[PDB]
Design a protein around this motif. Structure first.
Motif, PDB file in Angstrom:
ATOM      1  N   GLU A  82       0.858  -1.233   0.000  1.00 57.60           N
ATOM      2  CA  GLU A  82       0.000   0.000   0.000  1.00 57.60           C
ATOM      3  C   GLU A  82       0.878   1.262   0.000  1.00 57.60           C
ATOM      4  O   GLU A  82       0.450   2.310  -0.446  1.00 57.60           O
ATOM      5  N   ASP A  83       2.106   1.158   0.427  1.00 58.14           N
ATOM      6  CA  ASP A  83       2.984   2.363   0.377  1.00 58.14           C
ATOM      7  C   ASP A  83       3.520   2.531  -1.049  1.00 58.14           C
ATOM      8  O   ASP A  83       3.489   3.604  -1.620  1.00 58.14           O
TER       9      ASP A  83
ATOM     10  N   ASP B 224      -2.052   1.329 -11.382  1.00 58.51           N
ATOM     11  CA  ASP B 224      -2.790   0.614 -12.485  1.00 58.51           C
ATOM     12  C   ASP B 224      -4.292   0.501 -12.180  1.00 58.51           C
ATOM     13  O   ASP B 224      -5.094   0.755 -13.057  1.00 58.51           O
ATOM     14  N   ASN B 225      -4.705   0.208 -10.971  1.00 59.97           N
ATOM     15  CA  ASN B 225      -6.160   0.189 -10.644  1.00 59.97           C
ATOM     16  C   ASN B 225      -6.459   1.272  -9.605  1.00 59.97           C
ATOM     17  O   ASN B 225      -7.321   1.138  -8.756  1.00 59.97           O
ATOM     18  N   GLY B 226      -5.861   2.402  -9.816  1.00 65.44           N
ATOM     19  CA  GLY B 226      -6.177   3.627  -9.025  1.00 65.44           C
ATOM     20  C   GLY B 226      -5.871   3.445  -7.537  1.00 65.44           C
ATOM     21  O   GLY B 226      -6.519   4.054  -6.707  1.00 65.44           O
ATOM     22  N   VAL B 227      -4.871   2.685  -7.193  1.00 65.94           N
ATOM     23  CA  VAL B 227      -4.506   2.561  -5.750  1.00 65.94           C
ATOM     24  C   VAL B 227      -3.148   3.235  -5.532  1.00 65.94           C
ATOM     25  O   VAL B 227      -2.230   3.016  -6.298  1.00 65.94           O
TER      26      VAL B 227
ATOM     27  N   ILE C 116      -7.125   1.721   1.265  1.00 68.64           N
ATOM     28  CA  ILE C 116      -7.227   1.347  -0.178  1.00 68.64           C
ATOM     29  C   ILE C 116      -8.707   1.088  -0.481  1.00 68.64           C
ATOM     30  O   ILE C 116      -9.383   0.404   0.264  1.00 68.64           O
ATOM     31  N   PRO C 117      -9.244   1.765  -1.464  1.00 69.14           N
ATOM     32  CA  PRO C 117     -10.716   1.715  -1.708  1.00 69.14           C
ATOM     33  C   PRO C 117     -11.176   0.291  -2.033  1.00 69.14           C
ATOM     34  O   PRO C 117     -10.371  -0.608  -2.192  1.00 69.14           O
ATOM     35  N   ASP C 118     -12.469   0.056  -1.979  1.00 61.49           N
ATOM     36  CA  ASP C 118     -12.958  -1.349  -2.093  1.00 61.49           C
ATOM     37  C   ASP C 118     -12.750  -1.901  -3.505  1.00 61.49           C
ATOM     38  O   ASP C 118     -12.720  -3.103  -3.689  1.00 61.49           O
ATOM     39  N   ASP C 119     -12.623  -1.058  -4.501  1.00 63.05           N
ATOM     40  CA  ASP C 119     -12.450  -1.570  -5.892  1.00 63.05           C
ATOM     41  C   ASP C 119     -11.029  -1.281  -6.380  1.00 63.05           C
ATOM     42  O   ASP C 119     -10.732  -1.427  -7.550  1.00 63.05           O
ATOM     43  N   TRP C 120     -10.118  -1.043  -5.472  1.00 57.46           N
ATOM     44  CA  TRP C 120      -8.687  -0.944  -5.866  1.00 57.46           C
ATOM     45  C   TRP C 120      -8.144  -2.370  -5.991  1.00 57.46           C
ATOM     46  O   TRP C 120      -8.720  -3.302  -5.461  1.00 57.46           O
ATOM     47  N   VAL C 121      -7.094  -2.551  -6.702  1.00 59.82           N
ATOM     48  CA  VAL C 121      -6.563  -3.931  -6.900  1.00 59.82           C
ATOM     49  C   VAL C 121      -5.085  -3.917  -7.296  1.00 59.82           C
ATOM     50  O   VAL C 121      -4.502  -2.907  -7.635  1.00 59.82           O
ATOM     51  N   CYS C 122      -4.493  -5.060  -7.122  1.00 60.08           N
ATOM     52  CA  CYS C 122      -3.027  -5.244  -7.335  1.00 60.08           C
ATOM     53  C   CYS C 122      -2.652  -4.917  -8.783  1.00 60.08           C
ATOM     54  O   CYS C 122      -3.257  -5.404  -9.719  1.00 60.08           O
TER      55      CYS C 122
ATOM     56  N   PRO D  96      -8.578  -9.921  -5.446  1.00 63.92           N
ATOM     57  CA  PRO D  96      -9.633  -9.138  -4.736  1.00 63.92           C
ATOM     58  C   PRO D  96      -9.118  -8.517  -3.433  1.00 63.92           C
ATOM     59  O   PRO D  96      -8.518  -9.175  -2.606  1.00 63.92           O
ATOM     60  N   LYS D  97      -9.319  -7.238  -3.307  1.00 68.11           N
ATOM     61  CA  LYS D  97      -8.855  -6.497  -2.096  1.00 68.11           C
ATOM     62  C   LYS D  97      -9.138  -7.304  -0.822  1.00 68.11           C
ATOM     63  O   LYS D  97      -8.249  -7.503  -0.016  1.00 68.11           O
ATOM     64  N   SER D  98     -10.349  -7.708  -0.610  1.00 69.90           N
ATOM     65  CA  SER D  98     -10.705  -8.473   0.625  1.00 69.90           C
ATOM     66  C   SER D  98      -9.696  -9.600   0.902  1.00 69.90           C
ATOM     67  O   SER D  98      -9.469  -9.942   2.046  1.00 69.90           O
ATOM     68  N   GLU D  99      -8.977 -10.058  -0.091  1.00 69.44           N
ATOM     69  CA  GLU D  99      -7.819 -10.979   0.117  1.00 69.44           C
ATOM     70  C   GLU D  99      -6.660 -10.223   0.781  1.00 69.44           C
ATOM     71  O   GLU D  99      -5.507 -10.424   0.454  1.00 69.44           O
TER      72      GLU D  99
END
Length: 50
Positions: free
Chosen positions: A14-15, A20-23, A32-38, A44-47
């Motif tokens: 996260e730092d 690429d997915n707006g994070v 990190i927003p709920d629809d951000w991703v690696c 899936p973020k929840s991972e």
């Protein structure tokens, strides 16, 4: 502090973030927003855990 994605494994730095997915940089994982991703596997973020 660092959450690893339990599905494709990606490290949710996260730092470093994942623009690429707006994070962003400086953004925290519990920030990190709920629809951000690696940027790599995008798993899936929840991972995320810390």
């Amino acid at each position: 502090a660092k959450y690893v994605c339990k599905i494709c494994g990606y490290i949710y730095d996260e730092d470093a973030g994942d623009p690429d997915n707006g994070v962003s940089p400086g953004t925290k994982f519990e920030e990190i927003p709920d629809d951000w991703v690696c940027p790599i596997c995008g798993a899936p973020k929840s991972e995320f855990e810390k």
